[PDB]
Amino acid sequence: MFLLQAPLQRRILEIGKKHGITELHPDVVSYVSHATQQRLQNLVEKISE
């Protein structure tokens, strides 16, 4: 996984508590990791351009 699975999991779970969320589907972690990799991938590509 691009991002660190354990702390990511914990941090997502953590942000949810503050926002009416009690649980989170499993692969949501991976999905967020993928999205974050895209966010950063585009910026880097742009920066190198």
């Binding site: 702390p7 942000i15 949810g16 009416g20 969320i21 989170l24 967020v32 880097v44």
Partner: protein, 74 residues
């Protein structure tokens, strides 16, 4: 706690341009951006979920926000 490593970041950078070591400050900035991204996205998603009258965070929620506020299609 750290969710992304300097190593993994650098692999990403390398993937875009194999010969290009990024300045540490830029590395930190990007690590900071990933943090804001996770924060805002997950936060906005939880809202969508809560709206579904739900309490379990699901891809559906994150995807909906990404597509709408980031025009990211994954």
């Amino acid at each position: 706690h750290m969710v992304l490593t300097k190593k993994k970041l650098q692999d990403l950078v390398r993937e875009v341009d194999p010969n290009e070591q990024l300045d540490e400050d830029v590395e930190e900035m990007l690590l900071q951006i990933a943090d804001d991204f996770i924060e805002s996205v997950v936060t906005a998603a939880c809202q969508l979920a809560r709206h579904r009258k739900s309490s379990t965070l699901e891809v559906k929620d994150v995807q909906l926000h990404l597509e709408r506020q980031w025009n990211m299609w994954i």
